[PDB]
């Protein structure tokens, strides 16, 4: 073992077929009493917002963290004049199912408040992006599951059909044990004829936002609370819960569906409140991982089309500490889609194609100042990415056996490239994850539009997350964002004892 | 790091790309000389039962835990009178397959023993309950591969064709890297006409039992044996082995197959026998775990179709220990539909949608009752369920274009609970899930038949497990159930050492 | 206690959803100061050979360990007399697309100098077998999603089209979240017409051989070089890139295509520099571990055809030490299929079926002489071998419905068998996989061929793995086989602290 | 109906009931027909209890 070069221990291990002799131990799993669920229903729910007001039933019982709220609605869909002729009834079997996910990407915001403190995000923004971190496929098959999960692979739906990854398409056609497209999920057809269609059934989503989890993995319970109460609010559009695709639009211009009506009925809330075993005790006061997210948007001028590049900035914004991490992306800008039953429903969610990313931290200009667009790639998927490079930079080159029709390009979906941000974006000496405060922050990348059929104007994006502890002592809850010491922060002992690979599943 | 509500201690550790300083150790891995694995042949086997009886090398000796067997079988189908024509080959395409898991649905009961003790799980109906629940994508491309393995998911093949989700599908067609369909399997066809067809081949399974593990962790092997013995024996039906869809069949319920014989040709196993290097000894006396599943059912003889709702309530059953873990299934029951080669030949092995399962401790009443059945998938998919949502509860539909023919449902697959006790149950104080104390159960569900074609009858199973320790020794097999003593789940320290998510991968 | 004497400890650990005691440390993550990609464009590039030259900036700055080289092509085709006509595009719509990979399937060699002293590794040959080996469906959507990617499951591209998982296909027909067929890649179509075609694009590939990787599964990176040199020599050939499917072409027949010329633009490497931060210093040397790959060639003057076998009897290769791992199959010879391109571009790379293996390692002179060929399959996927037992061994049945066109039988890839030494050989007591020796092995296997069509010439290969450290101390980098002794390996004290499956994750 | 108690200090009575408004189409079958007498008879006709 030792003789070469250095000198190194020597120790052995054992093939797994043969341990066989080591210390067996029986090991019993206690678990307190009284599991139960409780369904709360919506007081004062109205169409546009929902509230719940929901007391753990008594002070120290430790509530679980997975929650949901489930939704009956409806619709109605109505044949517009003039689309040159419609035959065949509006709904199609391979044209249309929901947008995924439905609810949320409706919500305006979500806020909670827990035990008299409120904690909120921004739903409808975030999480198309925060969606493809870092969902494994098995987990895609988890808790993912109950709403429609499908994300938008085409970057314009006309050229999905008909293939076999349309991302809205009969439950059929999925290959046996995947991802199945949105079209898959069920409900209600009351009635579906030309000129008419009415539909119905209860659909799911999970309240996001932490404390609370939506991953593989589960986590210690909040207790002990006194209080919590869950807002919605959803913005005002409504439209954006239908998708369309566009095939089906009369050739000149028009579409078949405008306009269309949708309801909500009260939606109730199911939450697990677990009492625990009366000889094991619980603390008094305790402390529980809590991350905050936060949006910057800034629109650019002018658009890019059909695939043409340019260069963005962006306006220094000061943060208060180092953010866990730090998305970027360029979508497709909302003030223009948002005319029109018909653009709403149409238009995929998809990104565009960034084929180069400049940044700077105070200090230090041209962070990354060169590196490979594709090198991007490459980090994450170290934090989790999940899709194939061709995806990314989305564009596929398909050619076609005839003569002599020219062969077409499809648009594949951009990027989102995230950074982890002392890992990856490098930093000085006596800084950590959760330091604070006060660093600039500019980003400089430029972008190609690879969507063939339509003129693009743009629009970057940012979003921060923050680590922060957050102690709940009933009654009470005391959330500090600035955890760390800058003089302890420095000068603390390494250790070998936990891989920084298992950081990488506490996430949020 | 302190300056939080409560003072929390501090560690460093580096992101992975550079460590880069630590003491890094070589490792020699040392298993012993010697590996070999022998095929014995079945003395005495006939059509009705296989038989083998298989002695180890010599003493010192550990055999290794993954056995199966393979057995070269005949089949000759015959076309009927007189549904004809006929037109056509008898055998299509994406028609016909084997069932999965063949050998193992066929077989009533697999008992085997070591050292004089006779461990015997009964295979029929567990394996379909089984099947489904713990094994993930990895898992299914491992050795779960030998047999064909792509459980039914279509409530009646009839509709099933013919999507690229096709249960009995040829090879070409399954998305590449993905579950295969039945009909991949290598069979050699001698003729295949109309009036006629054989097909020679031979087929692999994997003896499932406690002791062995049919799943990819390898652990410790059974040291020390001196004698061990399988036995097979299946049930006289013996045409449940082939499948076959319904679309041909008619006009009016006549079926084309009817009727075919199986034979089999002397079946042989595989064991796998290390020996330890001499220098390393092995204690005299191992320990290993061993648990123990027994179905307990009660089939009521009302009918429900071919989408209405009912309740039955499965019927008191005293027990000494609480199980691990407990299944609850209603499916479809197999008094009738063993009747007929027709009924036999074509019906699929899928369950029922649940709306509601409400159990009942002792004296409880009770229990988790108020959970929808929504939030009933949410455990488990937490210890595995490995199903979307979608295929639970499952029924879906599928538009329909063209005016003016209704939009047709379609029926998915069934869903089957499973609740560890501790963990999903709640229990009083001074109960691990394993000890030994006088209590009883009744649970009590409602259910929906969501097929739609056929009338169902429905029955249910509870399918529990037991934790206990084998202990093997020369020469001798105590095995004991509920280690431990009442008194001692009381007063037992609590470990931060081991984790919960570790238990998962120890089953089970 | 107790209750199973020998009498075991008892501990309770806690259920996943409550705690909520326990050591909650707050965990400051560090990695030091600017990190910085640069891109290396290559000067004396040429088309038929490449090679650039990079240090990094100083000593002291540890260099990361992922590399790749992204290189832009240019190629035109030629319509071929005289099967014309010889209608439609020379490309076709799921016809055609890159040999996977490509950069290194046609380059001949690679030789990577590190601190002065050079490693290489012969690429050509190696890869294609090496690949199916250690990629789970996580890390094929990682990484190495990179260069075109998919696998070849059919023996004739003839046969394939149009199935769901044919390997060359564009992006539509390919199922979500899978792998994707290799027509999805991108490539710039200038012009497409009978008689010619022209393309370009930009391709990625990463640098394959140890120290470099791969599976990520990060670890620590290189540090501290003063120069690192990369060569890469083509072979002349340079036709084997392209793929093509048999289906086209003339019936005697005449290929559509010969013949055509591959250019190439600069091509570039990429690689990013961390430097560590003032407060945690490196050490002046550190030791990384390191693998060769050699290979050993032997083959055979009788042909077999259509689907006959015979066996071999290989010649006597000699091994310098116990080697961590060896891979063994059996696949259509390399000296056909160069000549006359047609052949050269439509065969495929996939390997002969394997029914028995024999072989003389350590004068045992009978390993696995009775194993049957089914569990050496599975005794190799506890190695990861992540394809379906079906394709392994493969040959498929599929009929087919029209009286009465005979059945026809599809070959469908054979298997690599790999065998681990420790854990599957076993070897004479005191022997480890380090030690240095001189032995040498023999192979002896019965092989059957598969496909329809070519008469196939076979032959032997076998690769090996030898285990060392190699310690960079700039400037200079002994390298070292047999590290530990062999009165060392004996007497050497077994650590129950680390396990198994951790040894399964350093693979390189 | 889902309906949550106004203060849940407030005791809640025990008769509870609910009422739907409602609305049938009969129709004639040919044959039996005909058929020459009002489609609902005066003394051969109802509700089933309880409805």
Redesign the interface.
């Given at each position: 073992?030792?003789?070469?070069?250095?000198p190194?221990?020597?120790?052995?291990?054992?093939?797994?077929?043969?341990?066989?002799?080591?210390?067996?131990?029986?090991?019993?799993?206690?678990?307190?009493?009284?599991?139960?669920?409780?369904?709360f229903?919506s007081?004062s729910f109205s169409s546009n917002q929902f509230n719940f007001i929901c007391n753990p039933p008594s002070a120290q019982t430790?509530l679980?963290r997975?929650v949901?709220i489930?939704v009956p609605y409806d619709i109605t869909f109505t044949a517009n004049p003039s689309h040159a002729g419609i035959t065949?009834?509006l709904?199609?079997?391979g044209?249309?199912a929901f947008r995924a996910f439905p609810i949320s990407s409706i919500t305006n915001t979500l806020n909670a408040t827990i035990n008299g403190f409120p904690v909120n995000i921004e739903l409808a923004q975030i999480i198309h992006a925060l969606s493809r971190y870092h969902t494994?496929?098995?987990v895609?098959?988890?808790?993912m599951?109950?709403q429609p999960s499908?994300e938008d692979?085409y970057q314009s739906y006309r050229d999905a059909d008909g293939?076999?990854?349309?991302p809205l398409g009969?439950?059929?056609?999925?290959?046996?044990?995947?991802?199945?497209?949105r079209?898959?999920?069920?409900?209600?057809?009351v009635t579906?004829?030309?000129t008419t269609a009415r539909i119905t059934g209860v659909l799911?989503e999970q309240v996001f936002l932490p404390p609370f989890l939506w991953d593989g993995?589960?986590?210690?319970?909040l207790?002990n609370l006194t209080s919590l109460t869950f807002n919605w609010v959803l913005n005002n559009n409504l439209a954006r819960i239908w998708s369309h695709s566009d095939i089906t639009n009369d050739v000149s211009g028009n579409s078949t569906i405008g306009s269309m009506n949708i309801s909500f009925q009260?939606p109730?809330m199911?939450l697990?409140f677990?009492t625990?075993?009366?000889?094991?005790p619980?603390?008094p006061?305790?402390?529980y991982?809590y991350f905050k997210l936060s949006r910057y948007t800034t629109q650019f001028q002018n658009t890019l089309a059909p695939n043409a590049s340019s260069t963005f900035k962006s306006n220094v914004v000061q943060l208060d500490s180092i953010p866990r991490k730090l998305y970027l992306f360029v979508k497709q800008s909302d003030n223009v889609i948002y005319q029109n039953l018909n653009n709403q429903i149409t238009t995929p969610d998809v990104f565009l194609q960034i084929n180069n990313l400049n940044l700077t931290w105070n200090n230090?200009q041209g962070?990354?100042?060169?590196?490979?667009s594709?090198?991007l790639?490459?980090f994450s998927?170290?934090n989790g990415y999940?899709?194939?490079?061709?995806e990314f930079?989305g564009?596929?080159?398909?050619?076609?056996?005839?003569?002599?029709q020219?062969?077409k390009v499809?648009g594949?979906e951009g990027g989102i490239v995230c950074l982890e941000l002392?890992?990856?974006?490098?930093?000085?000496?006596?800084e950590?994850?959760?330091v604070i405060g006060n660093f600039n922050l500019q980003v400089q990348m430029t972008v190609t539009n690879t969507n063939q059929y339509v003129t693009v104007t743009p629009d970057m994006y940012i979003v921060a997350v923050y680590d922060g502890?957050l102690?709940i002592?009933n009654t009470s809850a005391?959330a500090?964002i600035?955890?760390?010491?800058k003089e302890?922060?420095?000068?603390?002992?390494?250790?070998?004892?936990?891989?920084?690979?298992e950081?990488q599943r506490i996430y949020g």
């Open positions: 073992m030792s003789n070469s070069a250095i190194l221990n020597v120790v052995a291990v054992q093939e797994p077929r043969l341990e066989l002799n080591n210390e067996r131990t029986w090991v019993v799993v206690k678990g307190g009493q009284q599991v139960t669920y409780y369904p229903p007081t430790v679980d997975l949901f489930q065949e009834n709904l199609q079997p044209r249309d494994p496929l098995k895609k098959n988890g808790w599951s109950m499908f692979n293939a076999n990854n349309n009969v439950f059929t056609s999925a290959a046996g044990l995947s991802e199945l497209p079209g898959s999920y069920t409900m209600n057809v579906n004829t030309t799911y993995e589960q986590a210690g319970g207790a009260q109730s199911y697990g677990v625990p075993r009366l000889n094991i619980i603390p006061r305790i402390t991982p230090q962070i990354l100042s060169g590196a490979s594709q090198n790639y490459d998927v170290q999940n899709k194939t490079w061709s930079n564009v596929t080159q398909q050619f076609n056996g005839v003569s002599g020219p062969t499809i594949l002392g890992k990856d974006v490098g930093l000085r000496d006596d950590a994850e959760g502890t102690v002592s005391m500090s600035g955890v760390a010491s302890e922060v420095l000068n603390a002992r390494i250790t070998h004892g936990v891989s920084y690979n950081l």
